Amino acid sequence: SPKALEEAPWPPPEGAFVGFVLSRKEPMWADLLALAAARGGRVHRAPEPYKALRDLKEARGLLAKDLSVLALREGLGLPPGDDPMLLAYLLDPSNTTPEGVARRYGGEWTEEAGERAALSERLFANLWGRLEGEERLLWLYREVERPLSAVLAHMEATGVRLDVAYLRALSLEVAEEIARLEAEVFRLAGHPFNLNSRDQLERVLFDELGLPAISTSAAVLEALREAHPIVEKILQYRELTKLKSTYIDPLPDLIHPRTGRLHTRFNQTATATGRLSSSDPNLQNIPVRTPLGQRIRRAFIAEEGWLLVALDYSQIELRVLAHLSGDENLIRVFQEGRDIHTETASWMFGVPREAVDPLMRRAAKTINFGVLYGMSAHRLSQELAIPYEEAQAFIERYFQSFPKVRAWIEKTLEEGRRRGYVETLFGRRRYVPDLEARVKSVREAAERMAFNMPVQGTAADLMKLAMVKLFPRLEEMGARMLLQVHDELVLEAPKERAEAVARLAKEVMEGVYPLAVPLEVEVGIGEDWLSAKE
């Protein structure tokens, strides 16, 4: 609340825990409604929240980096300080919101700024207790998590320029295809009807054309996409319409009046693995590698005499797997610069060396990516149309080739079975209690999380440590860090500094942490995100 003769006048003494209400928003768009800062029992309040920000040497407290985004907007240099959201996330990745951590560790997260400043003091003290008897998690808070919040802040306030001419042009292009698809669906129906009305779709599918399963479960559609050339046309209609109303149409609306750029929200404590995420737009969902997703990525442009430099960890998940499993054969695929899918197909087919693969080099790519989370043999047989027997053979043949990967899988399910959590190369853990559940499907899953977390998790902490390390150096050359999606970074360098920024960034990212295999980052320089693909 706080307590007793608690209220003081603004400003607080340094090291105080700030609190803050915003206008039902995301920072760059909201107004700072209230402001506050508890220190040693007292609650200082602000008279007028904005002038008050210049008192603060930094923002300590819950959601410290959203305050820094607001304040960066307003030309201030406020660094995000300590944040109990970052400590409670390290303690346990399922601690993703303010209200939840308060509900778990004690305290009400309420919508009154001095109470949220009080709470921040309390919750930091509680949590720093629980975490300072922990050397791998304290490393991670000082070397990765607290610096990244400053990096993320500048990212979210800088923004990316969009190409609005192009986005409106595209909208018309995709709306055209939507209308061609729909003429096709009407033709294969004899009459026009409403593709969106459930009444009418099941009247066609089930009555007019007497399809199988003939609703019961909603959206049944997907499964019976068989002989009739229409019920996949319904589908390609459902996703361009999903896409258009998601990534093309709303995006010029999301541009800032003060900036003329999009301000993508970057979240640090939202995922199970510890990957970063984006919120409006969610950049992870723009369909990558389809004709349309690369078409959406061209709408992301550089400032007017600047260039974009994209960077991309080549096969970070398999290289982490090689490293973590100590598999001499996977290690040496990479250490000597060989194609992973070719070499796998060479081991797995026992081809007289690398001799005329290409069907083989398809089977293998499918095993390679598929083992990671855990493609069962039936679906393996789906992508790879094959029998249960040849398919199970491809799987044990992958493990006869790479047997320390089988070692690691089992070492991991066992060691997580007995201690009750799994870790990252760096020490980040996810508690895995369901990994013994007698109910088949929830335990099946706990096991998938148990082997994914160390590989997707270590890949995540290596991107983050690369970001933290590059953010100084980019300022010494005046370039910006714009977007992080998947295993990619997008930078913005002035046209005259763009290849030199591109070399520093490959350098930093590749040498960031010593692994048994080389990390490889691809780098491309372009005026729009699609051209920087290199």
Ligand X SMILES: Nc1ccn([C@H]2C[C@H](O)[C@@H](COP(=O)(O)OP(=O)(O)OP(=O)(O)O)O2)c(=O)n1
Q: Tell me which stretch binds ligand X (CB under 6 A): 52-60, 143-151, 363-371, 438-446.
A: 363-371
CB of 459 to ligand X, least distance (A): 10
Cβ distance to ligand X smaller for residue 195 or 449: 449
Widest CA span of the chain, in angstroms?
84
Minimum gap (Å) between residue 379 Cβ and ligand X: 10
Minimum gap (Å) between residue 16 Cβ and ligand X: 44
Interaction between residue 319 and ligand X (CB under 6 A): no
Smaller CB distance to ligand X: residue 499 or 520?
A: 520
Q: Which is nearer to ligand X, 128 or 369 (CB)?
A: 369
**Total binding residues toward ligand X, as defined by CB under 6 A:** 7
Q: Which of 44, 116, 365, 428 binds ligand X (CB under 6 A)?
A: 365
Q: List CB contacts of 51: < 8 A, sequence separation 6 or more.
A: none
Spatial distance between the Cα atoms of 193 and 423, rounded to a whole number of angstroms: 54
Q: How far is the CB of 366 from ligand X (least distance, A)?
A: 8
User: Nearest CA to 65 among 257, 282, 266?
Assistant: 266
Task: State which residue, 486 or 495, has the beta carbon closest to ligand X.
Answer: 486
Closest among 32, 4, 5, 6 to 19, alpha carbons compared: 32
Residue closer to ligand X by CB (options 364, 467) is 364
Q: Tell me if residue 53 falls in helix, strand or coil.
A: coil
DSSP 2-24: --SS-EEPSSPPTT-EEEEEESS
> Which residue type, as a one-letter code, is found at position 10?
W
Q: Residue 4 Cβ, how far from ligand X at the closest point, in Å?
A: 56
Print the binding letters for residues 272-311 with ligand X: x by CB under 6 A, - otherwise.
----------------------------------------
Interface pattern 17-56 for ligand X (x via CB under 6 A): ----------------------------------------
Rounded to 5°, angle at Cα 369 from 366 and 372: 130
The full DSSP string for 455-515 is HHHHHHHHHHHHHHHHHHHHHTTT-EEEEEETTEEEEEEETTTHHHHHHHHHHHHHTSS--
Question: Percent helix, strand, coil in the chain (nearest 5)?
Answer: 50, 15, 35
Q: Which of residues 29, 109, 369, 399 is near ligand X by CB under 6 A?
A: 369
CB 139 within 8 A of CB 427: yes
370 binds ligand X (CB under 6 A): yes
Q: Which of 95, 149, 273, 315 binds ligand X (CB under 6 A)?
A: 315
Which residues fall within 8 angstroms of residue 532, CB to CB, at 6 or more apart?
307, 308, 309, 310, 490, 524, 525, 526
Binding flags for ligand X, 129-148, as an x/- string (CB under 6 A): --------------------
The tokens describing 146, both together, are 């607290």
Minimum distance, C-beta of residue 315 to ligand X, in the bound complex (Å): 5
Question: Residue 158 or residue 346: which is nearer to ligand X going by CB?
Answer: 346
Of the two residues 119 and 340, which places its CB atom closer to ligand X in the complex?
A: 340
Q: How far is the CB of 282 from ligand X (least distance, A)?
A: 16
Q: After which residues is the chain broken (C to N over 2.5 A)?
A: 214
| Residue range at the interface with ligand X (CB under 6 A); choices 1-9, 36-44, 119-127, 362-370 | 362-370
Q: In terms of CB distance, is 231 or 485 closer to ligand X?
A: 485
Query: How many angstroms separate the CA atoms of 376 and 373, rounded?
Result: 10
For strands 277-278 and 266-267, give the pairing: antiparallel
Binding segment for ligand X (CB under 6 A), chosen from 121-129, 166-174, 364-372, 505-513, is: 364-372
Residues 326-355 that bind ligand X (CB under 6 A): 339, 341
- Exposure letters 118-144 (e unless 16+ CB within 10 A, then b): bbbbbbbebbeeebeeeeebbebbeeb
Residue whose CB is less far from ligand X, 118 or 276: 276
Residue 488: CB minimum distance to ligand X, A:
9
Reported residue count of the chain is 534
Q: Which residue is nearest to ligand X (CB)?
A: 369
DSSP-derived letter for residue 420 is: S
Summarize as ranges the residues that interact with ligand X (CB under 6 A). 315, 339, 341, 365, 369-370, 486
